[PDB]
Design a protein around this ligand. Sequence first.
Ligand SMILES: [Mg+2]
Ligand SMILES: [Mg+2]
Lengths: 75, 195, 145, 55, 68, 143, 104, 144, 189
Amino acid sequence: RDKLNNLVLFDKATYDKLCKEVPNYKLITPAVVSERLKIRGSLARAALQELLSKGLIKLVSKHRAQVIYTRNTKG
Amino acid sequence: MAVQISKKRKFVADGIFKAELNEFLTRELAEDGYSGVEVRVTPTRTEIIILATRTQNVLGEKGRRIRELTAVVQKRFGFPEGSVELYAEKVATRGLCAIAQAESLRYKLLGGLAVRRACYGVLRFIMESGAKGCEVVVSGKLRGQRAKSMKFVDGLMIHSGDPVNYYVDTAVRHVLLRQGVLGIKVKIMLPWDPT
Amino acid sequence: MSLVIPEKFQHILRVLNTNIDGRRKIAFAITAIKGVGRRYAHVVLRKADIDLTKRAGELTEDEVERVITIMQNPRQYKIPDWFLNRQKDVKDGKYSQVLANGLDNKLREDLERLKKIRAHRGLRHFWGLRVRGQHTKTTGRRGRT
Amino acid sequence: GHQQLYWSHPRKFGQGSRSCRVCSNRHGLIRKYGLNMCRQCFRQYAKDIGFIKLD
Amino acid sequence: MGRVRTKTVKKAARVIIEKYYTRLGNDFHTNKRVCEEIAIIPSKKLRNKIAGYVTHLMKRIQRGPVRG
Amino acid sequence: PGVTVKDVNQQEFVRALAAFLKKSGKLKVPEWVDTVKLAKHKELAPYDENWFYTRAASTARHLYLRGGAGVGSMTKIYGGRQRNGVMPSHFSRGSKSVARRVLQALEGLKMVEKDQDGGRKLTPQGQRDLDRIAGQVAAANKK
Amino acid sequence: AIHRIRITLTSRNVKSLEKVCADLIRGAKEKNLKVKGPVRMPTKTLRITTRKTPCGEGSKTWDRFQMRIHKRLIDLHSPSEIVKQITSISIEPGVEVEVTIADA
Amino acid sequence: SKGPLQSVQVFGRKKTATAVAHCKRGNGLIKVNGRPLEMIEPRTLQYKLLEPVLLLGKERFAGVDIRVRVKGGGHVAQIYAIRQSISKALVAYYQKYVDEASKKEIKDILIQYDRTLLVADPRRCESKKFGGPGARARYQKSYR
Amino acid sequence: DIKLFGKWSTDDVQINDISLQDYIAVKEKYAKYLPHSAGRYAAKRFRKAQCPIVERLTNSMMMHGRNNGKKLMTVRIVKHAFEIIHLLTGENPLQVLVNAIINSGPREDSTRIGRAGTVRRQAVDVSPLRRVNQAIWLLCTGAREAAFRNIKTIAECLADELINAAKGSSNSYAIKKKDELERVAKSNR
RNA sequence: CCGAUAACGAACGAGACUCUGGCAUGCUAACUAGUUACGCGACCCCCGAGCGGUCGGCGUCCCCCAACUUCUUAGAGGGACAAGUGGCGUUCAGCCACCCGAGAUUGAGCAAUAACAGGUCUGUGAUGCCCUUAGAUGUCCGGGGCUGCACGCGCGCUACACUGACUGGCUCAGCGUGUGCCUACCCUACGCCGGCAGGCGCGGGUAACCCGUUGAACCCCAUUCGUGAUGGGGAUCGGGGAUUGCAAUUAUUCCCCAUGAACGAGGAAUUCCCAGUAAGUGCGGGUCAUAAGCUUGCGUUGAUUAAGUCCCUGCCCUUUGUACACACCGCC
Ligand SMILES: [Mg+2]
Ligand SMILES: [Mg+2]
């Protein structure tokens, strides 16, 4: 816990993890995505809205200070 | 119009004129029993009433003193010629004018009366003239070099709240002695009257 | 589309005599060059007509030299004379934006011109005190003790 | 001195141009509402002018 | 708290109750009206403080022998 | 179904009217829009490339809301907080040249005309355009 | 016409101002003049806040002087000329009058 | 059906913000300053303005045209003045046009859910004094 | 029928312990659409107990000068944090908040300044009102400290603080502080 | 204050009083304030409404050519008294709680006897004594200084950031000022030029008439940034452009582009504060040719804690002891 050196852009070993396990857990916010993936956070925002445009992530709030997503329901 | 000054500046100018005239009249007529000035301002012409005790002394030989005062006021304040008139009115019950008693006590002290005797005489005269109470305090270099104050209070004398504004007459006067300055404060609680 | 990092990504660029970090956006990455601020950087990127969103690392070398020459020659690209640093030079009177170790040499040249002319501001610089005529009685004690 | 330099310095502004209308003082003046009067002179003549203490 | 009535109201209330006990009654809003003409009270706040104390003292009188 | 701009979301209305102004490429734009800041109290130039179009949209909407606005009124409307560095912050007006250029662009776009007194208001054509855009944004919000 | 007269009365104490409004309105009503209602411009509070001390020593106690200016005005209406009908003012000291014709 | 003068004008206030509601017979409609009630910029307090209609019922409001003109204060003072004006205008219209059996059952529900929906908050402000930044605070003092 | 923030009915929340039922205000007449109903709750003693607990949380969450009057921002923050806690747990955010307050409010403390005997001096019990006040204060302090110098949002940190306090996992700042206070009270018995 | 009583009868102070704030759909009024209604309009809907929706667009004191005072203004009044109920209390003075009510402690102003070697002779044509009074300590003019820096202290301002900064959109105030006796210097709408500071013409306002419906900030809604001394912070410093003035250097102030230093919440200590209060946040006035990090006021958003204690710091009353009375900073 000295510096983050978070990734500004994805690699293969980060993009595959994003596409394989990010749409699994309930809470999807840019901050939690950045903390879980060691990415910048602006990149996390862009990736999350890209997933929404893909249609596999459900938005709930979309506020200036906080945007909140969730997984699609199964059943 | 634009030539005419605003209402706020006009009223402040009126107050300034009142204060300046009051100071000039106080300085010129202090020994003549001057007490206060009232002015009823009308656009056609203005009248200045001088409340005095020795009004016959204020009005000089055939009104020469009042003529001089009128001309002086006219010149100083730039009134149009003949548009300002000064009259003198004698104060009723001069013992109740706290200002007039201040110059009376100053006259006694300059004459050389003992300060205790002079203050007691003024206090007795005020009560005889009729007041709810009075308080005369004289401060300064009494007797020795060390400053002292003497207070002579008798009767009713309120200090706090609104009624002190309109129930007591307050006057402060300086007296110049060869040792220094004596400060005289005279407060007179006026009696209530429906008239 | 915020994909994986491009293969031809330069994490470290060597524009001019300074070094910049390619992980920040280009507009705030060229501000690392001395003599270039946020305003100048944004206007030269606007003139060079590149994507303000993309990072400095994914900027191709032709675009890099294009923005470099935009910075070095701002007068030819309609950048106004009031926007520059070295307007109306004290030596040759040529409007320019000096952004290099050249900026440092111009600064030391102005300082040494004042020192050799023995002006009051030059003497203040030589003594190491304030030059803009502000009070020194209580502030600035860090540089002395 | 002679007429050329006795009052030659301009006094169109500043504290030297303004003095109290009573005590001829240059400090604490009140130019609000065109009083042009000293700080203490106003305290002396406030009730005479018509300024009272309501609160 | 801080609802203590002073001499100025208490003495006045006692005097007006002694003088005009017959006219006075148990109604505060009627005692405040009779206080308009039975005495000259400079302030409305003073007059209704006096009227309230008058009603209180009359409630006491109807039971016991108050000093008034 | 008679709708007015007051009946729709103003923040989305200005966006849609800026889009309409972009689509109708008749708006005069000064060549220095890429250089200047929108006010002396702004630390940075605006991010959007179509800031002139959105300024024109906002100015037309404000002229709809109340007429007689001049350049000084526009600068007062678009003024904001200047942080003054270490000094305490204050309020600063807008950029008079930008406001005047926007108003002149609207006047040349015929949506705005001068009053008999100072300032300028919306022409009947301007009101028609504003209310048509209000209709389309109301329809878009509905569906 | 036919003439229009506005009388503005400005003073410092509401008692004298109201008296000088009331007697004017009463006289005009007795002479059956059409009197526009007495309108009251908002009062002006000239506030000056100075230091109580003359020397700057003490606990920094401030003196707050107020000056209240009250302004009323009236409009006089008649098919006949009004100056000849009412020429006096019937005022008391402390109030200032301002007669104005509607031309100005 | 065409009864003239079937209207009330009732004001509400909070912190120097006055909002006058003009209520009239007509279709169910409510607006402020010419804008719809739902089109109020601080949407964070949308429910504060929606509180009277939500509590009483759209059926109660189905016969009133309400136009609120608000000209003071800050944002939330505008909001509170507007909602108070709406509630008080409705209760006054019901008071002077329909029975007290309905007026009371509206007033009691409004005053039970929120007293400020019918009575003004009397607190305005406190004057600053000459020894501190605000009304009660004082400037920092030092002894050495 | 109220649905605080448009959702999450209040009547389904049950208060766990009898000691704080009269001081936690969530149900019946404490059912408001918004946690912003400024109503002179400090005018008398024991009146804030009638203030709804979401409004108390909102009032306590705006602190440290940088944001003191900004109550609309705090209302927004509470709304979001409720969305996140509902998303994580699947249960009622009001129930989660109530349980977090119950588990965060300390049950004993220390007092007296008698020369600082062992830790403070002498152990003391706490009133229900002080339990509620200290629970809300601890939750707000924990969220603020968790979200100060990091990328996690205030809403997210408030959410996880409340969730950890409700489940009693001792991963929360409020629970750790409460445990420390109880420990020093035990030492000062 | 009630009561006990060698005291009785009083006087001041407290209170009472004045101003301010909160309520009056009750009265008086309003073209220098408006609201409704109506008539002309302008735009949308037009399937079809049409007494449809918006207008700070124009009119109906441009006198026969509408009413009204709710909103605004300000006067007269009213209104709140511990008055009603329950309990406590000698059932006294009063206290607690509750109902109705706008209001059940709104803030200020004023403010006793006695005193201080407290401050001011640099406020005064207030003043005693003393000094100087023509090579002047009078007065005027030129220049410099009052800012000067190894350092210590006090009041503050800005910050240390994501509850944030930047960019854009939207949206709300109240105090109060404004053209000059001397005295020269006002507030500014609108149009044009410039990127900005500004400049150039035309007005309006001596003022509920014009600025001004004071389009204030914060806040609100979207964008970018992503925990790093970073788009935090803007100190320092270079260059250029304006404005005021007789004059800007030791930078008057303002604008633009560059530089981005300490600073990652601060030891011992210590200040202020109980409800529209603290605090965040701007706007006026004073000073002002040029000007606010100051002060005095105003609004805006708006809380945590507490309804207690004598622990610390002190204060009041009684008893008490005293070798003190320059009164414990005493005395010895
Ligand atoms: Mg008193
Ligand atoms: Mg930046």
